[PDB]
Amino acid sequence: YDLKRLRNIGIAAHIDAGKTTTTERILYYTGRIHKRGITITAAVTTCFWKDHRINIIDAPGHVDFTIEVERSMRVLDGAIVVFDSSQGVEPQSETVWRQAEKYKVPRIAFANKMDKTGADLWLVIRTMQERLGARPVVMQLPIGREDTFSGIIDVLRMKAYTYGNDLGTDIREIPIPEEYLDQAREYHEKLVEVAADFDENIMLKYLEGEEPTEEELVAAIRKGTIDLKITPVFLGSALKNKGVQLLLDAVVDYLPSPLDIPPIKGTTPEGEVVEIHPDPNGPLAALAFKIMADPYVGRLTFIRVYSGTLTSGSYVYNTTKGRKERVARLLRMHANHREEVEELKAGDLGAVVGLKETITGDTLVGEDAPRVILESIEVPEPVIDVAIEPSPTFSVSTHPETGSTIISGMGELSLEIIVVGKPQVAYRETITKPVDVEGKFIRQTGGRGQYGHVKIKVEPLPRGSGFEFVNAIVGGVIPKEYIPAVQKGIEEAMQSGPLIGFPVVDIKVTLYDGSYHEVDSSEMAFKIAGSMAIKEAVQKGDPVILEPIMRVEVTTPEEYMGDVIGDLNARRGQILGMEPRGNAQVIRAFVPLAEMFGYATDLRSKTQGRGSFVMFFDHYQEVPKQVQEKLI
Numbered sequence: 001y002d003l004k005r006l007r008n009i010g011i012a013a014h015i016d017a018g019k020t021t022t023t024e025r026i027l028y029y030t031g032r033i034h035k036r037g038i039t040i041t042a043a044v045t046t047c048f049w050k051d052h053r054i055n056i057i058d059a060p061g062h063v064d065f066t067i068e069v070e071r072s073m074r075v076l077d078g079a080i081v082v083f084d085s086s087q088g089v090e091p092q093s094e095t096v097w098r099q100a101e102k103y104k105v106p107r108i109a110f111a112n113k114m115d116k117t118g119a120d121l122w123l124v125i126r127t128m129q130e131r132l133g134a135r136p137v138v139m140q141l142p143i144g145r146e147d148t149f150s151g152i153i154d155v156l157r158m159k160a161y162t163y164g165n166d167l168g169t170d171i172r173e174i175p176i177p178e179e180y181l182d183q184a185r186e187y188h189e190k191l192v193e194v195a196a197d198f199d200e201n202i203m204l205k206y207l208e209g210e211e212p213t214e215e216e217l218v219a220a221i222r223k224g225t226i227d228l229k230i231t232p233v234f235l236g237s238a239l240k241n242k243g244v245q246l247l248l249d250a251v252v253d254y255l256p257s258p259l260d261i262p263p264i265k266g267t268t269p270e271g272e273v274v275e276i277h278p279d280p281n282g283p284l285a286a287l288a289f290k291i292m293a294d295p296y297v298g299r300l301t302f303i304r305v306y307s308g309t310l311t312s313g314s315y316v317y318n319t320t321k322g323r324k325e326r327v328a329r330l331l332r333m334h335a336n337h338r339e340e341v342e343e344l345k346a347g348d349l350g351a352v353v354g355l356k357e358t359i360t361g362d363t364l365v366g367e368d369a370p371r372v373i374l375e376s377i378e379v380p381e382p383v384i385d386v387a388i389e390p391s392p393t394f395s396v397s398t399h400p401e402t403g404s405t406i407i408s409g410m411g412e413l414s415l416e417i418i419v420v421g422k423p424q425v426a427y428r429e430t431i432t433k434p435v436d437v438e439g440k441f442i443r444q445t446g447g448r449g450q451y452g453h454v455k456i457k458v459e460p461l462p463r464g465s466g467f468e469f470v471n472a473i474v475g476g477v478i479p480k481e482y483i484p485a486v487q488k489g490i491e492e493a494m495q496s497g498p499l500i501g502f503p504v505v506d507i508k509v510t511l512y513d514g515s516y517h518e519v520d521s522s523e524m525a526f527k528i529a530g531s532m533a534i535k536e537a538v539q540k541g542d543p544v545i546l547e548p549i550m551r552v553e554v555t556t557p558e559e560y561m562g563d564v565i566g567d568l569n570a571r572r573g574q575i576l577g578m579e580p581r582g583n584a585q586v587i588r589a590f591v592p593l594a595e596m597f598g599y600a601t602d603l604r605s606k607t608q609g610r611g612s613f614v615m616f617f618d619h620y621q622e623v624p625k626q627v628q629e630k631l632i
C-alpha cells in the first residue's frame with residue numbers, strides 16, 4: 001500500500017463513443033499478468049498497471065443527466081474523456097465535458113475510432129478549442145488515416161508505435177517515419193512551449209534551444225492537467241486494439257492520485273465544516289456510494305475510504321443513521337474474481353460484507369472515531385407521480401384513483417429509473433376565504449336507522465402550515481363515542497378535492513356543533529356526515545389550485561442565450577440570474593413543473609443540442625386564473 005500509486009478514475013463519453021470497449025480492453029491489458037457472459041457489473045473494479053492500482057469507478061445509472069452523478073464524480077479522482085474522432089466534440093460530449101469542470105476533476109482526452117472513415121484528430125482539437133474553450137495539448141500524432149491507421153507518434157518522447165494486427169498481440173516501437181518528421185518536430189516544439197508555461201526552467205531552455213528532459217516535461221504537463229489548465233489529447237482505436245496501453249501509461253503519468261486533489265469536507269457533531277486529509281493512521285471516515293445484491297455473499301456495500309483504515313472483523317459506526325455495524329468481511333472486485341482482504345486504507349475503494357442498515361450516501365466511522373458526516377442529509381420531495389399498475393425517491397403509495405398504485409419522485413427522467421402510466425404533476429388544493437358549513441347523513445340503510453350530523457368551520461392557513469383540527473363540541477351534543485368516526489371521515493375526504501381531485505392541504509377545521517339520535521346514531525353515519533361537510537367547505541371556500549414551482553438551471557452557449565430566455569419566459573418563467581461557467585452561461589429560473597414536460601428536447605432544438613438543465617422542487621404556488629380555468 002502506497003497512496004501515491006493509486007489512480008481512482010472514471011471513463012466519460014457520449015453513448016456511442018466507446019466507453020465500454022475502452023474499459024474492457026483496459027481490463028484486458030491490466031489483467032494479462034498472473035491471471036460468464038456479462039456486462040461488467042461492479043461499482044468499482046480494481047486492476048494493476050505498472051505498479052499502480054487503478055480503481056475504475058463505473059457510472060451506469062442511466063440517462064446520466066441525473067443529480068445522482070455528482071456522487072459518482074465525488075468518489076473518483078480523475079477522468080478519461082472519450083471523443084469519437086469522426087465528429088469532434090459531440091453535443092452530449094459537450095455536456096459530459098461541462099460536468100467535469102463543474103466538479104474540478106482533472107481529465108485527459110482520448111480521440112477514439114481513429115480507424116473509422118472520417119476520423120480526424122484536428123477536428124477534435126479545433127472543436128475542443130472553439131466549443132469547450134479547452135486548451136488541448138497535442139500529445140500524439142496518427143500514422144496513416146482511417147482504414148490505413150496503423151501507428152501512433154508520441155511527440156513528448158519523439159517515439160512511434162506500429163500495430164501488426166487488431167488483436168492487441170503485436171506492438172512494436174518504430175522510428176518516426178520520414179514524412180512525419182517535420183510535423184512531429186513542429187508539434188514537439190508546441191508541447192515544449194505549453195510545458196514552458198508551467199515551468200520557468202523549461203521556458204529558459206526553450207529560448208536557448210535546449211531540449212528539456214522527459215521527466216521535466218511530464219511533470220509540467222502533469223501540473224497543468226491537475227491545475228485544470230490544459231488537456232493532453234491521446235488517440236487510438238479501442239476496437240482495433242491500438243493506443244490503449246499508451247492510454248494506460250497516460251493515466252499513470254498525468255492523472256491524479258488522492259493526494260493531488262483537494263480533500264473532501266465534513267460536518268462534525270459541533271456543526272463546523274472541516275477538511276479531512278487522506279491519512280491511513282488517522283481515524284476512520286468512509287462513504288458508501290452503491291449497494292448491490294450479489295448472489296455469492298448477499299448484500300454488498302461499496303465504499304471509498306477518505307481517512308484511517310477499515311479492518312475486517314470489527315465494528316464500525318454509521319453516522320448518517322446512528323447505528324452499529326459489523327464488518328464481517330471486506331472484498332475487492334477484480335475483472336474475473338473477488339478477493340478477500342484484511343483491510344482497506346485511506347484513498348482506496350472496495351466492498352463490505354455484513355452491513356445491515358447502511359444505504360448509499362451514508363458515512364461510516366471507526367468505533368471510537370469522531371462522528372463526522374460527509375454528505376448533506378437533505379431528503380428531497382415527491383413532486384411527480386406515475387401510476388405504474390398495468391427509498392431514494394422511488395416512493396410507493398396507494399390512495400385515490402381506486403385500484404391504482406403510484407411511484408412518486410422528482411425530476412422527469414431522474415425519478416424515472418424504475419421506469420404503464422404517464423407522468424403527472426402533484427397538485428394540491430386549498431381555500432381562500434373562511435367558511436362555515438354542515439354535514440348531514442340521515443337515512444334508512446342496511447337493516448337499521450342511520451343518523452349523523454356535524455357542523456364545521458374551515459379557515460385557510462398560511463401557505464405550508466399543514467392541517468389543524470379542533471373539537472369545540474359541548475355537553476355531548478355529538479356523543480363522545482362518535483368523534484373518532486367524524487375525524488376519520490374528514491380525513492378521508494381531504495384526500496380528494498373539488499377542482500381536480502388532489503389532496504387538500506392548508507386548512508384549519510373546527511368541529512363545533514351537530515346532533516344525534518338515541519338509537520339511530522352510529523360510527524358509520526358520523527363518518528359520512530364529516531366527509532360530506534369538508535367536501536362542501538372546499539367548494540364554497542373560493543378554492544384555488546396549488547402547483548409546485550421548480551428551481552431550474554440551464555447551461556447554454558452564448559449564441560443561443562437570447563432564444564432560451566425567450567423560451568423560458570413563454571413557459572411562465574421568471575429569470576432569476578445569469579452567471580458564467582467556462583465559455584457557457586448558466587441561467588437560473590423559477591418555472592412551473594407543468595411547463596417542464598419534454599423540456600430536454602425543446603432546449604436541444606433551440607441550442608443545437610449543446611445545452612442541458614437541472615431541476616429542483618422549490619415551493620407550492622397558486623396557478624393564475626387562466627391556468628386554473630384551463631386545468632379542466
Ligand SMILES: Nc1nc2c(ncn2[C@@H]2O[C@H](COP(=O)(O)OP(=O)(O)NP(=O)(O)O)[C@@H](O)[C@H]2O)c(=O)[nH]1
Nearest residue numbers: 014015016017018019020021112113116237238239
Ligand atoms: N471503428 C471503431 N468502432 C468502435 C471503436 N470503439 C468502439 N466502437 C464501436 O462503437 C460502438 C459503441 O461501443 P460502446 O463501447 O458500447 O460505446 P459506449 O459509449 O459504451 N455505449 P453506451 O454508453 O451506450 O453503453 C460499438 O459498435 C463499438 O464496437 C473504435 O475504436 N473504432
Ligand SMILES: [Mg+2]
Nearest residue numbers: 015019020021
Ligand atoms: Mg456501453
